Amino acid sequence: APDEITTAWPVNVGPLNPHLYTPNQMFAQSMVYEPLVKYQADGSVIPWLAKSWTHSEDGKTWTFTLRDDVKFSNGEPFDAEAAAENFRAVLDNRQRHAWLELANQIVDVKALSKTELQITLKSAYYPFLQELALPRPFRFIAPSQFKNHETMNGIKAPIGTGPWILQESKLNQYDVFVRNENYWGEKPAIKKITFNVIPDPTTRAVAFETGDIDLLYGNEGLLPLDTFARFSQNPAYHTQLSQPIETVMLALNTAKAPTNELAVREALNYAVNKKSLIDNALYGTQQVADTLFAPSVPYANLGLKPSQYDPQKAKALLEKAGWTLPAGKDIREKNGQPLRIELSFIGTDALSKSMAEIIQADMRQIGADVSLIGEEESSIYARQRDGRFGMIFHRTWGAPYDPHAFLSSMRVPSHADFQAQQGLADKPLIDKEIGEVLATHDETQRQALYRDILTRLHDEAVYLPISYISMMVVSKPELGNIPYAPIATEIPFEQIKPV
Ligand SMILES: O=C(O)CC[C@@H](CC(=O)O)C(=O)O
Numbered sequence: 459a460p461d462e463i464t465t466a467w468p469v470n471v472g473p474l475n476p477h478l479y480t481p482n483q484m485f486a487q488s489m490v491y492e493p494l495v496k497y498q499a500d501g502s503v504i505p506w507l508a509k510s511w512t513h514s515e516d517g518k519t520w521t522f523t524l525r526d527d528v529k530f531s532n533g534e535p536f537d538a539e540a541a542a543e544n545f546r547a548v549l550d551n552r553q554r555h556a557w558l559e560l561a562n563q564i565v566d567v568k569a570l571s572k573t574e575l576q577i578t579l580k581s582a583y584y585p586f587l588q589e590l591a592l593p594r595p596f597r598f599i600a601p602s603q604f605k606n607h608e609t610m611n612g613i614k615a616p617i618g619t620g621p622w623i624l625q626e627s628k629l630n631q632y633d634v635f636v637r638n639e640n641y642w643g644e645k646p647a648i649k650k651i652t653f654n655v656i657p658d659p660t661t662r663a664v665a666f667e668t669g670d671i672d673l674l675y676g677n678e679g680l681l682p683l684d685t686f687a688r689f690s691q692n693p694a695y696h697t698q699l700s701q702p703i704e705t706v707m708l709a710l711n712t713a714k715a716p717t718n719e720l721a722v723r724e725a726l727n728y729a730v731n732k733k734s735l736i737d738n739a740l741y742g743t744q745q746v747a748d749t750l751f752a753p754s755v756p757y758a759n760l761g762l763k764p765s766q767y768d769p770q771k772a773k774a775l776l777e778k779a780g781w782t783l784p785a786g787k788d789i790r791e792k793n794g795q796p797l798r799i800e801l802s803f804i805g806t807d808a809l810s811k812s813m814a815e816i817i818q819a820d821m822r823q824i825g826a827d828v829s830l831i832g833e834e835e836s837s838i839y840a841r842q843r844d845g846r847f848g849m850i851f852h853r854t855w856g857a858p859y860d861p862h863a864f865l866s867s868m869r870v871p872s873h874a875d876f877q878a879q880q881g882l883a884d885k886p887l888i889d890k891e892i893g894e895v896l897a898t899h900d901e902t903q904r905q906a907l908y909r910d911i912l913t914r915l916h917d918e919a920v921y922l923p924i925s926y927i928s929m930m931v932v933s934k935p936e937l938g939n940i941p942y943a944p945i946a947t948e949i950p951f952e953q954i955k956p957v
Contacts, residue, residue, distance in 0.1 A: 459957045462650040463672040463937070464725055466876030468657050468679075471633040474616035476620020476626055476681060477548045477595040477609045480839070484593045484947040489635060491530075491597030492573075494541075495587050497858060499944040501756075502589050506576070507536065507619070517582030518565075520576040527546025528642040530600045531617040534661040538569035543601040544609075544870075545577075551595075551610035557867040559896050560589040560596075563907055584899055588858055593947060609756065621646045646952040660685070661810065666695075666932055674932040675949050677922050678706075679809055679933065683741035689932055696933045696940075702926035703946045704856035708801070708849045709818070709874050710797045711923055713881030716797055717848055721827075725920035726799075726849070727765040728772040729824045730817055735924050739812040747923035749916055751854065751861050753845035757908035758936045759862060772824040783825055790825035797826045802841055810851050813924065817849075845877035849922070853945075865892045865911065878921075884914050 471486035494508035505511070508522035528536045533787075544770040545567040548555065555561035563586075565578040579586065589594050603614040616624050621643065625636040634831040635714070654671070656662050665671045672681055681689075690697035710726065711717040730748045748764035777783075781790040781797050790797040803810035803815065811832060818828045828849070841847045851906040852874050854860045868875040869889040879885050888911055895907040931940045943950040 460652075461648060462652070463648055463671045463954070463956065464652045464654065465675065466656050466662050466669065466671055466677075467633070467653045468655070470627060470629060470655055471624065471653065473613065475613050476599045476616075476618065477551065479554075482594070485949045486624075487925075488593040488620075488943075488945070488948040489596065489622040490616055490624060490646055491594075491599060492619040492620055493540060493597060494524075495590050496590035497944050501588070501858065503591055505593075505615045507541075514578075515569065518578065518580070518637065519578040519587070521570065522577070524573040524575060525642065526573055528619055528621055529640055531638055531640070532600060534600050534602060534617075534692050535599065537572050538575045539572075540601045540764070541575055541598060541660055542567045542569045543607075544598045545596070547607075547609040548561065548595045550608060550627070554871045554872070555595055557873065558589060558592070558595075558863060559583075559866045559893075560586065581897065582899070583896075585896060587863060589863070591945075592860075592863075594946060600631070603698065622651070625955055633946070644952075647955050648951060651951060657806075663689075667935075671817045672934050673937060675929070675942065678740065678744060678927040679807070680930050682808075683743045686930060687741060687743065694935070695937045696931075696937070698927040698931040699743065699941060700931075702745060702752060702928055704854040704860060705752060705923060705926045706851065706853040707747060707750065707846075707923040709852040710849055710919065711845065711847055711878050711881070711940070712918070712920060713845065713877070714848065715767040715795075716781075716792075716799060718867055719779060720880050720919060721775050722781070722797070722799075724765070725772045725775045725779070725824060726821065726826070727767040727919055727922055728775070729826070730820045730922065730924075731767040732924060733767075735816050735820075739809065739816060740925060740927075744927045747925045749923055750912065750921055752926050755860055757905060758907055758912060760912060762913065765919075766794070776824060781825065787824065788825070789827045798829065799826060800829045800831055801849040801916055802831045802833060802838055802847050803851050804835050804838055806835075807832075813851070815854065824932040842874035842877065843872055843881065849873060850878075852925075858945065861908065861912075862896065865908075866896055868892060879915075882920070883920055884918060888914055902917075913919045 472482040474483050474490055476491045494501045494504055496506040509525050511522040513520045530536050546750055551560050563583050564580050570576050600617045605612040621638050621641040622635040623638045624722050626634040633653040635651045637646050659681045663685045666674055710723050714766050716722045749762045751758040753759040781792045784791050803814050814830050821828050855864050869892055891907050891911050898904050933940055941950045941953045
């Protein structure tokens with residue numbers, strides 16, 4: 459069966475609720491639901507569901523001209539009314555979509571013609587279109603699929619206008635998608651796709667080796683990085699390491715002891731040996747990260763000073779900061795307390811645990827005792843809102859979120875970044891400039907803003923950049939080159955031309 463292919467994923471696709479996050483896997487959501495406008499690599503956008511559009515001279519009111527020849531998955535019709543209903547459906551939950559400034563920007567939406575769609579915003583929002591193209595929450599599910607007239611409280615059956623229809627899902631085993639025969643665009647060469655739920659990376663590797671897996675698409679965690687290196691040397695397989703897409707780092711808690719002290723945060727930076735960590739835990743397959751964003755990220759090439767591995771400098775800062783060594787002890791104490799710091803991570807994540815132990819051992823050489831708290835992913839995401847952490851693995855989102863959406867998110871008190879930045883005297887001002895960066899049409903004002911924000915976050919040592927990671931692919935040679943989607947979180951299955 460060429461028309462058909464099997465792949466893998468650590469967890470099920472989820473309910474495929476277009477307007478909800480966890481556990482709805484993004485790539486999947488992007489398979490079923492579509493946007494009015496679609497994101498391009500050049501950073502621009504092309505018309506999609508919205509055939510073309512028009513805007514008020516004052517740029518606050520927008521009117522899109524939808525496609526008529528577009529039928530929802532279940533034969534139903536896609537029109538301005540369903541659209542308005544989705545937006546409305548989404549906005550009824552605006553509070554949680556607070557991270558995406560477009561959310562708290564939509565004044566209201568209403569249906570003009572059967573195909574005319576009018577959107578008015580509080581302001582002439584320049585990130586309007588690029589933010590509609592996102593995988594969520596402004597995608598569309600048939601109105602005839604709510605739990606009342608609400609999607610925030612669940613949906614009926616995941617039906618959209620995508621080219622892929624979730625034909626079947628079975629907890630802990632697989633998720634099946636079939637080609638949507640009544641799609642409005644080009645016909646996807648693959649007719650069926652099957653995702654095998656396989657948590658372990660080593661298992662995913664063997665799974666591929668049996669011949670039962672056509673492809674493996676994911677990030678640094680896909681399969682063990684050394685096996686991937688053996689795999690790329692194998693004539694019968696095919697592998698690919700994309701260039702960096704986002705950065706992984708630790709987030710230090712400024713609003714909590716002892717990470718409430720700039721000295722301790724700076725010292726934590728000079729104590730970790732990135733390379734040794736990278737070469738040893740990531741198998742030299744990814745690259746070292748000095749700043750929150752790589753210099754190749756628009757607006758981020760700021761010449762920020764990299765903190766180099768320097769145990770020497772490390773313990774010197776720490777002591778001047780009042781954390782001295784007591785007779786007969788390896789760990790530093792201040793006014794009675796030891797320099798203990800807890801590091802939370804997904805206990806069942808082989809990668810996090812490794813960098814964890816390395817970091818732990820690195821810190822111990824400067825008199826700091828870090829405790830590893832490997833926990834359920836649910837408790838981890840919990841401590842991120844709660845702010846119950848000392849240090850915490852965290853990562854950016856790749857294009858097109860980085861850097862504007864990811865910054866926007868820092869303002870919302872419902873996330874790790876906000877939480878970690880809390881105890882910063884700069885915070886109020888930083889959030890002020892993020893809203894301003896999202897608000898100015900002047901490129902030079904924008905350049906300066908990103909500079910001020912990113913320089914503060916950097917100088918105040920909020921994070922401990924570790925590495926810029928890549929997307930990897932392992933596939934059967936018959937599938938040819940596996941393309942990358944402009945949106946970092948999507949998998950371009952429709953482009954895969956088998957044999
Ligand atoms: O799914 C998205 O579009 C953004 C979700 C984001 C976390 C959040 O803001 O709740 C993330 O973890 O990437």
